Design a protein around this motif. Sequence first.
Motif, PDB file in Angstrom:
ATOM      1  N   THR A  83       0.836  -1.189   0.000  1.00 39.02           N
ATOM      2  CA  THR A  83       0.000   0.000   0.000  1.00 39.02           C
ATOM      3  C   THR A  83       0.873   1.241   0.000  1.00 39.02           C
ATOM      4  OG1 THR A  83      -1.832  -1.062   1.179  1.00 39.02           O
ATOM      5  CG2 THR A  83      -1.726   1.347   1.270  1.00 39.02           C
ATOM      6  N   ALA A  84       0.536   2.184  -0.871  1.00 38.45           N
ATOM      7  CA  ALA A  84       1.247   3.454  -0.964  1.00 38.45           C
ATOM      8  C   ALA A  84       0.164   4.527  -1.067  1.00 38.45           C
ATOM      9  CB  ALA A  84       2.143   3.475  -2.206  1.00 38.45           C
ATOM     10  N   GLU A  85       0.457   5.740  -0.609  1.00 34.89           N
ATOM     11  CA  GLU A  85      -0.525   6.822  -0.662  1.00 34.89           C
ATOM     12  C   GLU A  85       0.085   8.062  -1.288  1.00 34.89           C
ATOM     13  OE1 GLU A  85      -2.222   6.884   3.518  1.00 34.89           O
ATOM     14  OE2 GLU A  85      -3.872   6.061   2.328  1.00 34.89           O
ATOM     15  N   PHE A  86      -0.754   8.841  -1.961  1.00 36.92           N
ATOM     16  CA  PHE A  86      -0.297  10.029  -2.661  1.00 36.92           C
ATOM     17  C   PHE A  86      -1.114  11.238  -2.235  1.00 36.92           C
ATOM     18  CE2 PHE A  86       2.423   7.386  -5.146  1.00 36.92           C
ATOM     19  CZ  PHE A  86       1.836   6.142  -4.916  1.00 36.92           C
ATOM     20  N   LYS A  87      -0.408  12.265  -1.771  1.00 36.09           N
ATOM     21  CA  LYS A  87      -1.044  13.466  -1.252  1.00 36.09           C
ATOM     22  C   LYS A  87      -0.916  14.713  -2.111  1.00 36.09           C
ATOM     23  CE  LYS A  87      -1.630  12.918   3.730  1.00 36.09           C
ATOM     24  NZ  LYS A  87      -1.668  11.430   3.824  1.00 36.09           N
ATOM     25  N   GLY A  88      -2.058  15.354  -2.356  1.00 32.68           N
ATOM     26  CA  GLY A  88      -2.093  16.569  -3.155  1.00 32.68           C
ATOM     27  C   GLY A  88      -3.513  16.818  -3.634  1.00 32.68           C
ATOM     28  N   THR A  89      -3.700  17.761  -4.552  1.00 35.61           N
ATOM     29  CA  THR A  89      -5.050  17.987  -5.060  1.00 35.61           C
ATOM     30  C   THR A  89      -5.454  16.693  -5.770  1.00 35.61           C
ATOM     31  OG1 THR A  89      -4.055  19.088  -6.987  1.00 35.61           O
ATOM     32  CG2 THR A  89      -4.892  20.489  -5.210  1.00 35.61           C
ATOM     33  N   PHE A  90      -6.757  16.416  -5.821  1.00 34.26           N
ATOM     34  CA  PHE A  90      -7.268  15.163  -6.379  1.00 34.26           C
ATOM     35  C   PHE A  90      -6.685  14.597  -7.673  1.00 34.26           C
ATOM     36  CE2 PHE A  90     -10.226  12.266  -8.441  1.00 34.26           C
ATOM     37  CZ  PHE A  90     -10.521  11.377  -7.408  1.00 34.26           C
ATOM     38  N   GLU A  91      -6.786  15.331  -8.774  1.00 34.83           N
ATOM     39  CA  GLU A  91      -6.287  14.791 -10.032  1.00 34.83           C
ATOM     40  C   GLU A  91      -4.765  14.695 -10.084  1.00 34.83           C
ATOM     41  OE1 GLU A  91      -8.201  13.234 -11.784  1.00 34.83           O
ATOM     42  OE2 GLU A  91     -10.201  14.129 -11.766  1.00 34.83           O
ATOM     43  N   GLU A 126      -0.268  10.846  -9.948  1.00 35.97           N
ATOM     44  CA  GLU A 126       0.968  10.417  -9.310  1.00 35.97           C
ATOM     45  C   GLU A 126       0.869   8.965  -8.837  1.00 35.97           C
ATOM     46  OE1 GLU A 126       1.286  13.679  -6.607  1.00 35.97           O
ATOM     47  OE2 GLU A 126       2.360  14.914  -8.077  1.00 35.97           O
ATOM     48  N   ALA A 127      -0.311   8.562  -8.383  1.00 28.48           N
ATOM     49  CA  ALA A 127      -0.501   7.186  -7.940  1.00 28.48           C
ATOM     50  C   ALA A 127      -0.287   6.231  -9.117  1.00 28.48           C
ATOM     51  CB  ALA A 127      -1.909   6.999  -7.367  1.00 28.48           C
ATOM     52  N   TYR A 128      -0.891   6.547 -10.259  1.00 25.81           N
ATOM     53  CA  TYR A 128      -0.730   5.691 -11.428  1.00 25.81           C
ATOM     54  C   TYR A 128       0.708   5.707 -11.922  1.00 25.81           C
ATOM     55  CZ  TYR A 128      -5.830   5.175 -11.778  1.00 25.81           C
ATOM     56  OH  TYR A 128      -7.157   4.873 -11.553  1.00 25.81           O
ATOM     57  N   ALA A 129       1.358   6.866 -11.843  1.00 26.26           N
ATOM     58  CA  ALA A 129       2.754   6.989 -12.257  1.00 26.26           C
ATOM     59  C   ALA A 129       3.611   6.053 -11.408  1.00 26.26           C
ATOM     60  CB  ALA A 129       3.230   8.428 -12.086  1.00 26.26           C
ATOM     61  N   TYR A 130       3.282   5.943 -10.121  1.00 19.73           N
ATOM     62  CA  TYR A 130       4.038   5.058  -9.249  1.00 19.73           C
ATOM     63  C   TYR A 130       3.786   3.604  -9.660  1.00 19.73           C
ATOM     64  CZ  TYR A 130       5.802   2.422  -5.374  1.00 19.73           C
ATOM     65  OH  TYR A 130       6.500   1.479  -4.658  1.00 19.73           O
ATOM     66  N   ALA A 131       2.523   3.261  -9.891  1.00 23.54           N
ATOM     67  CA  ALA A 131       2.177   1.902 -10.304  1.00 23.54           C
ATOM     68  C   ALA A 131       2.977   1.523 -11.546  1.00 23.54           C
ATOM     69  CB  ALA A 131       0.680   1.804 -10.599  1.00 23.54           C
ATOM     70  N   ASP A 132       3.127   2.479 -12.460  1.00 24.07           N
ATOM     71  CA  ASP A 132       3.866   2.245 -13.697  1.00 24.07           C
ATOM     72  C   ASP A 132       5.320   1.833 -13.462  1.00 24.07           C
ATOM     73  OD1 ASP A 132       1.774   2.621 -15.471  1.00 24.07           O
ATOM     74  OD2 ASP A 132       2.226   4.738 -15.835  1.00 24.07           O
ATOM     75  N   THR A 133       5.945   2.342 -12.402  1.00 22.10           N
ATOM     76  CA  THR A 133       7.332   1.975 -12.128  1.00 22.10           C
ATOM     77  C   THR A 133       7.458   0.519 -11.680  1.00 22.10           C
ATOM     78  OG1 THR A 133       7.377   2.537  -9.755  1.00 22.10           O
ATOM     79  CG2 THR A 133       7.782   4.328 -11.337  1.00 22.10           C
ATOM     80  N   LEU A 134       6.337  -0.111 -11.343  1.00 23.43           N
ATOM     81  CA  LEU A 134       6.364  -1.493 -10.879  1.00 23.43           C
ATOM     82  C   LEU A 134       6.066  -2.511 -11.979  1.00 23.43           C
ATOM     83  CD1 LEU A 134       4.624  -1.131  -7.391  1.00 23.43           C
ATOM     84  CD2 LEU A 134       7.029  -0.886  -8.011  1.00 23.43           C
ATOM     85  N   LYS A 135       5.751  -2.025 -13.177  1.00 18.82           N
ATOM     86  CA  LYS A 135       5.428  -2.912 -14.295  1.00 18.82           C
ATOM     87  C   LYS A 135       6.611  -3.745 -14.774  1.00 18.82           C
ATOM     88  CE  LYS A 135       3.659   0.155 -17.106  1.00 18.82           C
ATOM     89  NZ  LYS A 135       3.003   0.619 -18.364  1.00 18.82           N
ATOM     90  N   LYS A 136       7.809  -3.175 -14.702  1.00 24.35           N
ATOM     91  CA  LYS A 136       9.012  -3.869 -15.142  1.00 24.35           C
ATOM     92  C   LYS A 136       9.181  -5.219 -14.448  1.00 24.35           C
ATOM     93  CE  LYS A 136      12.503  -1.308 -15.948  1.00 24.35           C
ATOM     94  NZ  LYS A 136      13.607  -0.327 -15.741  1.00 24.35           N
ATOM     95  N   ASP A 137       8.927  -5.257 -13.145  1.00 26.93           N
ATOM     96  CA  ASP A 137       9.078  -6.492 -12.387  1.00 26.93           C
ATOM     97  C   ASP A 137       7.773  -7.219 -12.085  1.00 26.93           C
ATOM     98  OD1 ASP A 137      11.999  -6.371 -11.937  1.00 26.93           O
ATOM     99  OD2 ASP A 137      11.510  -4.579 -10.768  1.00 26.93           O
ATOM    100  N   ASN A 138       6.642  -6.544 -12.268  1.00 22.66           N
ATOM    101  CA  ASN A 138       5.355  -7.151 -11.949  1.00 22.66           C
ATOM    102  C   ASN A 138       4.346  -7.251 -13.089  1.00 22.66           C
ATOM    103  OD1 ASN A 138       5.766  -7.436  -8.879  1.00 22.66           O
ATOM    104  ND2 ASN A 138       6.276  -5.282  -9.264  1.00 22.66           N
TER     105      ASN A 138
END
Length: 67
Positions: A22-30, A35-47
């Motif tokens: 679990t990871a959380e991203f703080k800031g205005t909604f959009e 940023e949350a999806y951008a983080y998920a994208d960094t995990l595609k290489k191994d997952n």
Amino acid sequence: HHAMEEVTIKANLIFANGSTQTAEFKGTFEKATSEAYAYADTLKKDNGEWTVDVADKGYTLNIKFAG
């Protein structure tokens, strides 16, 4: 008038073998959501590629990786 409050988008990452993270991203909604999806994208290489199910009115992103 769009919501400008600082919010937290929770990303429930679910991997192929069932393990989770679990990871959380703080800031205005959009901005934070992107940023949350951008983080998920960094995990595609191994997952692998991911799919998402948006919950809690958009404040929770259940992101599942394939493979």
